[PDB]
Swiss-Prot record, chain A:
Disulfide bonds join 8-34, 10-50. It comes from Homo sapiens. This is Small-inducible cytokine B6, N-processed variant 2. The lineage of its organism: Eukaryota, Metazoa, Chordata, Craniata, Vertebrata. Coiled coil: none annotated.
Swiss-Prot record, chain B:
Belongs to the G-protein coupled receptor 1 family. It is found in: Cell membrane. GO terms for biological process: calcium-mediated signaling; cell surface receptor signaling pathway; cellular defense response; chemotaxis; dendritic cell chemotaxis; immune response; inflammatory response; interleukin-8-mediated signaling pathway. Keywords: Cell membrane, Chemotaxis, Disulfide bond, G-protein coupled receptor, Glycoprotein, Membrane, Phosphoprotein, Receptor, Transducer, Transmembrane, Transmembrane helix. The chain holds residues 33 to 330 of 360 of the full protein. This is C-X-C chemokine receptor type 2. GO terms for cellular component: cell surface; external side of plasma membrane; mast cell granule; membrane; microtubule cytoskeleton; mitotic spindle; nucleoplasm; plasma membrane. The gene is CXCR2. Phosphorylated upon ligand binding; which is required for desensitization. (Microbial infection) Proteolytically cleaved by Staphylococcus aureus staphopain A/SspP. This cleavage inhibits CXCR2-dependent neutrophil activation and chemotaxis.
Length: 65, 298
């Protein structure tokens, strides 16, 4: 795309989600782009949500990756 | 329910094309003006007054900035695909030229204040340090621009195209905020304070004069100050707004992100005209340079 000031991909986090409804999962680690680790879940209906990397279940899933 | 969701960084092709055209036009105009000023000054060594040295240095700074502009235009076209070494070199040169131009405007203002206010006294003998002042300004700009050289590299992301961004660590986002205090402190606040003080007292002394040509001098001084403000105020205001938004002082929304992001580019484009308008504002507005240019035409 085009950007001169890179910024975080999520503003707020969701703790209410069902694993079955999740279609794709992506992880953005901390780097020059954004301070906080981001976990983006794109659901089967086209909606995407941002999850807490500190959540126990999601934290374990990310660590397994 | 729908509060939490990704925000898409949005862009349009028309903006890209417009930026390309504007940057090229500014490149050509700045090159022409700076080259003409340098040719006029250097051709004949008759009366190499201090203002001549200052205008020479200012023209060199603007010419270098214009020379660096095209790579920035390409970066805006498609992001930084030109490599890390070019990112470092171009960023260093750009920042050094920007700092030197601003501080040279400040020094010219100081010279005018010491020339028209403290004119009868012996303090006027302290303005013959143009060589040392200019060298010191170049050195200070060079030293202040090294953070760009040390901590700038190509940055990759899945949704954002390449750009010559900073790489200071995993919490670099906050670090850039502290870094920004430099350009916004010794780049707008100190220079604006010096110019305001100097030109205000110069205006007072001229207003208390019975000369025959007070009018044009007052007009030119006001023109210089207003042009500087019109050129650089929006960029600094948008920068402060962006820093506050990253500080969560101002409520942050995806649309606010998009607005500020577009405003940054627009204000940068508007401000860049400091390299184009300087030759007319400072040099060609005086009869000496017009006479010299006409004489050289033989």
């Amino acid at each position: 795309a085009v950007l001169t000031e890179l910024r975080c991909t999520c503003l707020r986090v969701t703790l209410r989600v069902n694993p079955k409804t999740i279609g794709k999962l992506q992880v953005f680690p901390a780097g020059p782009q954004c301070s906080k680790v981001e976990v983006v879940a794109s659901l089967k209906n086209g909606k995407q949500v941002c999850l807490d990397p500190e959540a126990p279940f999601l934290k374990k899933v990310i660590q397994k990756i | 329910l729908l509060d939490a969701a990704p925000c898409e960084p949005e862009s349009l092709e028309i903006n890209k094309y417009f930026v390309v055209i504007i940057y090229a036009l500014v490149f050509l105009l700045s090159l022409l003006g700076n080259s003409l000023v340098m040719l006029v000054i250097l051709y004949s060594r008759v009366g190499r007054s201090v203002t001549d040295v200052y205008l020479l240095n200012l023209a060199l700074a603007d010419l270098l900035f214009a020379l660096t502009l095209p790579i920035w235009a390409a970066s805006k076209v498609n992001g930084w695909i030109f490599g890390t070494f070019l990112c470092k070199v171009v960023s260093l040169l750009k920042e050094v030229n920007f700092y030197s131009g601003i501080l040279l405007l400040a020094c010219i203002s100081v010279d005018r204040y010491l020339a028209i206010v403290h004119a009868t006294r012996t303090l006027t003998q302290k303005r013959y340090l143009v060589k040392f002042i200019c060298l010191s300004i170049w050195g200070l700009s060079l030293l202040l621009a090294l953070p760009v050289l040390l901590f700038r590299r190509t940055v990759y992301s899945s949704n954002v195209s390449p750009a010559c961004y900073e790489d200071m660590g995993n919490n670099t986002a906050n670090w850039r905020m502290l870094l920004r205090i430099l350009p916004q402190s010794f780049g707008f606040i100190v220079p604006l304070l010096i110019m305001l003080f100097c030109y205000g007292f110069t205006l007072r002394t001229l207003f208390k004069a019975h000369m025959g040509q007070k009018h044009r001098a007052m007009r030119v001084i006001f023109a210089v100050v207003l042009i500087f403000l019109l050129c650089w105020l929006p960029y600094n205001l948008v920068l402060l707004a962006d820093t506050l938004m990253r500080t969560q002082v101002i409520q942050e929304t995806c649309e606010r992100r998009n607005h500020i992001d577009r405003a940054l580019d627009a204000t940068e484009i508007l401000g860049i005209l400091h390299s184009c308008l300087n030759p007319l504002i400072y040099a060609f507005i005086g009869q000496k340079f017009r006479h010299g240019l006409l004489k050289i035409l033989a």
